[PDB]
Amino acid sequence: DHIHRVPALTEEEIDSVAIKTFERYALPSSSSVKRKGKGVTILWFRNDLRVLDNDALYKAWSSSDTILPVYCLDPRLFHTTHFFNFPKTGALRGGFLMECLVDLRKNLMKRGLNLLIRSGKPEEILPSLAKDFGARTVFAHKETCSEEVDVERLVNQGLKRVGNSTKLELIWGSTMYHKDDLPFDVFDLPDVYTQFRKSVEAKCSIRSSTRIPLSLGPTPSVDDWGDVPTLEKLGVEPQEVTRGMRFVGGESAGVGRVFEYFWKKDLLKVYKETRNGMLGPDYSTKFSPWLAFGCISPRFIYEEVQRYEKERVANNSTYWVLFELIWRDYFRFLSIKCGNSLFHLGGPRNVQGKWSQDQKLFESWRDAKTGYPLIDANMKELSTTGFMSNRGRQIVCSFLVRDMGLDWRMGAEWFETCLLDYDPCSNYGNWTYGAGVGNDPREDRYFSIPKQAQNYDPEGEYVAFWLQQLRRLPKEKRHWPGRLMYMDTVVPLKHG
Numbered sequence: 001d002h003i004h005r006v007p008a009l010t011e012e013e014i015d016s017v018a019i020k021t022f023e024r025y026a027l028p029s030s031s032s033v034k035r036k037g038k039g040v041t042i043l044w045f046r047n048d049l050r051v052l053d054n055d056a057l058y059k060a061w062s063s064s065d066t067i068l069p070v071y072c073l074d075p076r077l078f079h080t081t082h083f084f085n086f087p088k089t090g091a092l093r094g095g096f097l098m099e100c101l102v103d104l105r106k107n108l109m110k111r112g113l114n115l116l117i118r119s120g121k122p123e124e125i126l127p128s129l130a131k132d133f134g135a136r137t138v139f140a141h142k143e144t145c146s147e148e149v150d151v152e153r154l155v156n157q158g159l160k161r162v163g164n165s166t167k168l169e170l171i172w173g174s175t176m177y178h179k180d181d182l183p184f185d186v187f188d189l190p191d192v193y194t195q196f197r198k199s200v201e202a203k204c205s206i207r208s209s210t211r212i213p214l215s216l217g218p219t220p221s222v223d224d225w226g227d228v229p230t231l232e233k234l235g236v237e238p239q240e241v242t243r244g245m246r247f248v249g250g251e252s253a254g255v256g257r258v259f260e261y262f263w264k265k266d267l268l269k270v271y272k273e274t275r276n277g278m279l280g281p282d283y284s285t286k287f288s289p290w291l292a293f294g295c296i297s298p299r300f301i302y303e304e305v306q307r308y309e310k311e312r313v314a315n316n317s318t319y320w321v322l323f324e325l326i327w328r329d330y331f332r333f334l335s336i337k338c339g340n341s342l343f344h345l346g347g348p349r350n351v352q353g354k355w356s357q358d359q360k361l362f363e364s365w366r367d368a369k370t371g372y373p374l375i376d377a378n379m380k381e382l383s384t385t386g387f388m389s390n391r392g393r394q395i396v397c398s399f400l401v402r403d404m405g406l407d408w409r410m411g412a413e414w415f416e417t418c419l420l421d422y423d424p425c426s427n428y429g430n431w432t433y434g435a436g437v438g439n440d441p442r443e444d445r446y447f448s449i450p451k452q453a454q455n456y457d458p459e460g461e462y463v464a465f466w467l468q469q470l471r472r473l474p475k476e477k478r479h480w481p482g483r484l485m486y487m488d489t490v491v492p493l494k495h496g
């Protein structure tokens with residue numbers, strides 16, 4: 001078949017939906033906020049590429065009279081992964097990022113601002129801009145993992161080294177439940193998801209999304225706002241989606257997908273019954289890439305769900321989308337409690353010894369040549385589109401770790417290279433769980449390829465779509481085609 005744009009909306013539809021959505025959440029009046037004499041501030045964007053429900057943007061605006069929005073294309077983002085040195089950012093996510101930047105500049109311009117784009121390290125670019133424009137502060141969202149917090153440290157020290165006079169203000173964001181509202185400090189986050197969930201749902205409230213004014217200007221006088229970099233300048237060979245889902249970067253496209261899934265298609269009311277699907281855009285929200293880049297936020301999604309429940313229907317599916325967003329919150333907070341044990345072979349559980357790093361075995365998994373259609377189709381979906389269904393990710397993870405016996409980080413780093421929605425907290429969090437090195441032993445499980453195939457792809461419709469040489473075969477053969485109609489198997493399945 002062809003490439004399915006996600007969202008499937010036309011460029012005009014995306015623009016009108018974005019306008020209506022921005023309109024719906026616009027700040028009624030800026031009456032009560034005085035900006036006179038507050039000076040210049042720099043807003044440093046990272047993975048919060050949106051205008052809507054952006055607390056850093058709001059705080060920057062309300063504490064200044066002029067804002068200089070900046071995005072730094074950090075050279076380290078295009079180097080290599082930590083342990084196995086795969087590309088740090090694969091071509092597909094890189095392409096999605098560029099679309100996100102183009103859209104952010106466009107949306108900032110609509111509110112009277114613009115986005116200064118520079119290529120280089122934030123700790124070198126920001127202190128320089130702060131001095132040049134006499135900014136009193138640099139606002140940004142707080143991140144949680146080692147690499148990102150190290151950059152925060154370098155930027156903070158860079159600003160001090162040019163004087164006091166300039167402060168880095170990090171704002172908590174990204175989560176549906178706010179860190180400050182939790183019924184426990186993250187150091188004491190429950191190691192069992194169910195307990196974390198029951199606690200926040202019983203003792204916490206979700207904050208309303210932050211309303212942003214329609215007028216946010218002016219910016220300082222800038223001679224060159226910068227071109228959006230090209231992947232080629234960054235040393236990445238562009239790659240386009242040849243088949244399947246083609247996700248469209250940017251906040252505009254993101255709110256367009258929320259509109260598309262919830263309202264236009266009215267699929268939210270059946271979400272829970274379909275979320276284990278693997279084929280097509282319809283089986284789940286597909287919000288992950290926009291959430292990862294911060295093109296959309298969970299507080300916004302929650303308010304849309306509330307409106308849906310009021311106007312259309314409230315049931316187990318409308319609630320389940322929130323259940324899943326809580327999983328995202330959980331791994332984000334867990335990243336703080338775990339620190340770098342999140343990336344260590346033994347994981348947070350600080351487990352065992354073992355594991356092979358057999359390059360040949362790994363490559364067969366990576367290149368979709370394991371000989372098992374269920375596995376191969378998923379790995380091909382990933383390298384072709386930068387996305388994989390949640391069901392598929394759990395399965396390929398179990399296969400790599402349990403059937404192939406490989407160092408789980410090889411799989412985690414490959415996902416890091418390929419996923420449009422790559423998020424360290426969620427990626428490594430879910431990998432530690434699947435690998436059995438997280439701190440909830442009740443989640444340690446082996447996925448039977450035959451059973452999974454039977455339960456989630458009975459007609460072999462999914463593997464057939466991705467592995468066209470199986471399309472002619474009847475089911476039964478689709479999943480056990482044999483070595484001639486398909487290919488040899490690289491390893492026996494660990495469980496009979």
Ligand SMILES: Cc1cc2nc3c(=O)[nH]c(=O)nc-3n(C[C@H](O)[C@H](O)[C@H](O)COP(=O)(O)OP(=O)(O)OC[C@H]3O[C@@H](n4cnc5c(N)ncnc54)[C@H](O)[C@@H]3O)c2cc1C
Pocket residue numbers: 275284285286287288289291292321324325327328329331388389390391393394397415419421422423424426427428430431434
């Ligand atoms: C090995 C492995 C690696 C993963 N890597 C990532 C990753 O790098 N980034 C990422 O965002 N998700 C990751 N996931 C979680 C989950 O598979 C994806 O969020 C989901 O497939 C994204 O598609 P969706 O938006 O249609 O999902 P939906 O089912 O529509 O869920 C809605 C939202 O809930 C959140 N969510 C749902 N399930 C999970 C989960 N298990 N953990 C965390 N958040 C969840 C996401 O933000 C998602 O967009 C991983 C899962 C596994 C098993």
Ligand SMILES: Nc1nc(=O)c2c([nH]1)NC[C@@H]1CN(c3ccc(C(=O)N[C@@H](CCC(=O)O)C(=O)O)cc3)CN21
Pocket residue numbers: 082145146147148340343344416423424
């Ligand atoms: N977005 C993102 N953020 C990250 O921080 C991150 C990724 N992705 N991808 C995976 C890598 C690997 N992660 C790691 C892994 C190990 C240490 C580590 O062992 N640190 C030592 C101290 C420094 C040293 O001696 O190496 C430690 O004792 O914790 C740090 C970060 C950070 N990683």
